[PDB]
Amino acid sequence: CKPVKWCALSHHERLKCDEWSVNSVGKIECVSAETTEDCIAKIMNGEADAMSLDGGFVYIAGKCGLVPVLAENYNKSDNCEDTPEAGYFAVAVVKKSASDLTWDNLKGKKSCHTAVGRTAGWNIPMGLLYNKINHCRFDEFFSEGCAPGSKKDSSLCKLCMGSGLNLCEPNNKEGYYGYTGAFRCLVEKGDVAFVKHQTVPQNTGGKNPDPWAKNLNEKDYELLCLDGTRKPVEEYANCHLARAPNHAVVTRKDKEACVHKILRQQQHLFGSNVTDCSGNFCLFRSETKDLLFRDDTVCLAKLHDRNTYEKYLGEEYVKAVGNLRKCSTSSLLEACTF
């Protein structure tokens, strides 16, 4: 069991893993690979033992026989490490005042996305719209919109609000970037916003004091259901697109107990309760951003029932990511699905 070999996919990740390794006094060791898929392959063949992956890669890793064993939890609580979070629900929000707007006729409408490539703002809705997309041209489905990160001259930059050269940039200098930004986009310019289930409630009724949000009313918005109907934003349960999971640590099934034990001890040592991270090693802090784990991680929580990809990932989520893979394929996925 000792040591658990962690796989790093960047120079900065490897540096952090090196630091972790010596601080762990050999309970953790480091291996590098060029890309995420190369790391997954190393875990499959025993050259590495574990890494943390986003939902799309938990899917690929699972098709390859690896299992998720810990969820990254992002919220504080007294039972964090024994209580894995389920993530959030991606939703499509429209104005109640909008006439004739449903899931079935989004083609050619005006869209607001958190950013290109984001799970709630792009991957989930585009993956579910797949059947109506022509030749993988996701950027040609809507007439125009704001999807920060798009090409400066794309129809999906037309609605963005960034001043100067910040226009359509995937960062906070672009006003329509992010969950709150995409909702602002809906309120100000667009027809539909792709956000998550907390977004409207947290940005209405004064909960967000910013001028654009402070006087909004939750009742002015509705959700688009996959069946073509609409519901109030409070009723996302059976009117959402897909459940987006937290990132998960994956490993070979026969290393599940080992990884549980070692990582629980590691987070007790170096996790979110470390009082002074200045100069000291902290597992969930990064010199840049989100190295090895998301910087938002509070703890790694043991999975019980949801320790397979099919149980960890939502059904519509798997459909969405599967469809995206039809437009951007993976040699690893191919090798594993034969």
Side-chain angles (χ1 to χ4, degrees), residues 1 3-98 101-151 154-164 166-172 174-337:
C1 180
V4 168
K5 296 182 287 289
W6 206 269
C7 197
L9 38 69
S10 77
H11 182 57
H12 290 336
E13 280 206 347
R14 175 61 182 265
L15 291 181
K16 178 175 175 176
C17 194
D18 289 338
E19 190 179 355
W20 187 8
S21 182
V22 298
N23 276 275
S24 78
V25 188
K27 291 182 189 302
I28 295 292
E29 284 186 353
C30 295
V31 181
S32 285
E34 285 195 326
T35 66
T36 300
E37 285 180 19
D38 294 326
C39 271
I40 292 170
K42 287 190 179 187
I43 296 170
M44 293 165 66
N45 70 24
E47 290 172 19
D49 298 320
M51 68 194 297
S52 190
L53 294 176
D54 68 24
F57 282 118
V58 170
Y59 172 72
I60 295 177
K63 288 303 228 301
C64 293
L66 303 182
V67 292
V69 302
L70 295 154
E72 292 184 0
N73 274 2
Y74 308 131
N75 301 336
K76 295 184 182 65
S77 85
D78 299 292
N79 303 101
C80 184
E81 62 180 19
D82 286 315
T83 318
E85 293 163 15
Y88 62 80
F89 299 89
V91 295
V93 185
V94 298
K95 294 184 290 295
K96 182 177 188 171
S97 63
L101 195 55
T102 82
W103 181 253
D104 300 321
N105 66 24
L106 286 177
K107 191 186 225 308
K109 300 288 134 66
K110 298 182 178 69
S111 65
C112 301
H113 308 260
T114 60
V116 55
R118 299 270 172 171
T119 295
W122 187 266
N123 295 352
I124 285 172
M126 293 303 192
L128 294 178
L129 286 164
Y130 169 73
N131 281 327
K132 298 182 280 184
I133 299 295
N134 296 312
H135 289 100
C136 298
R137 303 262 184 102
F138 300 110
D139 54 26
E140 296 180 14
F141 183 76
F142 295 100
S143 60
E144 62 180 353
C146 180
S150 295
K151 298 173 183 178
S154 182
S155 63
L156 285 183
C157 278
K158 289 183 176 295
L159 290 190
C160 293
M161 82 174 226
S163 67
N166 297 324
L167 176 61
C168 202
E169 287 298 294
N171 66 76
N172 261 24
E174 163 56 61
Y176 295 166
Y177 168 75
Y179 293 109
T180 65
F183 179 48
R184 186 177 179 180
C185 176
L186 168 64
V187 171
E188 299 184 351
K189 299 185 180 181
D191 295 317
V192 60
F194 298 105
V195 294
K196 58 185 179 178
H197 72 277
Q198 307 96 322
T199 304
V200 174
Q202 293 180 355
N203 291 284
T204 51
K207 292 155 224 141
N208 178 351
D210 290 9
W212 68 265
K214 68 182 306 182
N215 302 128
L216 300 177
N217 305 123
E218 180 163 358
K219 71 168 58 178
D220 295 339
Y221 310 95
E222 287 184 326
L223 304 180
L224 304 180
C225 315
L226 288 171
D227 67 8
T229 63
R230 291 155 61 131
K231 291 198 180 80
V233 310
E234 294 91 342
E235 296 181 33
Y236 66 90
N238 298 313
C239 190
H240 66 266
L241 307 184
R243 183 175 60 79
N246 288 10
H247 296 193
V249 173
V250 304
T251 188
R252 300 184 299 284
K253 179 69 175 185
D254 77 281
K255 286 290 190 179
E256 184 179 24
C258 167
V259 169
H260 282 162
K261 177 185 180 63
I262 295 297
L263 274 288
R264 180 163 288 184
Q265 184 75 0
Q266 290 303 299
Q267 70 188 356
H268 288 174
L269 282 146
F270 301 122
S272 63
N273 95 164
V274 170
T275 63
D276 183 22
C277 290
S278 174
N280 293 288
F281 176 69
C282 287
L283 193 53
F284 307 131
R285 308 277 194 95
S286 297
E287 189 258 312
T288 58
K289 169 176 192 57
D290 300 334
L291 303 171
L292 304 182
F293 302 100
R294 285 242 246 102
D295 293 329
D296 280 335
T297 303
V298 172
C299 83
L300 301 172
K302 183 180 177 182
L303 293 166
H304 312 88
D305 295 321
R306 289 146 52 204
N307 64 348
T308 65
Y309 83 93
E310 263 148 340
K311 286 180 293 182
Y312 187 75
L313 302 177
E315 321 299 351
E316 290 298 315
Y317 186 74
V318 165
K319 181 176 177 173
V321 300
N323 289 346
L324 282 187
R325 281 317 186 180
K326 302 180 178 184
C327 282
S328 62
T329 64
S330 164
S331 70
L332 180 63
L333 189 57
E334 178 70 12
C336 296
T337 57

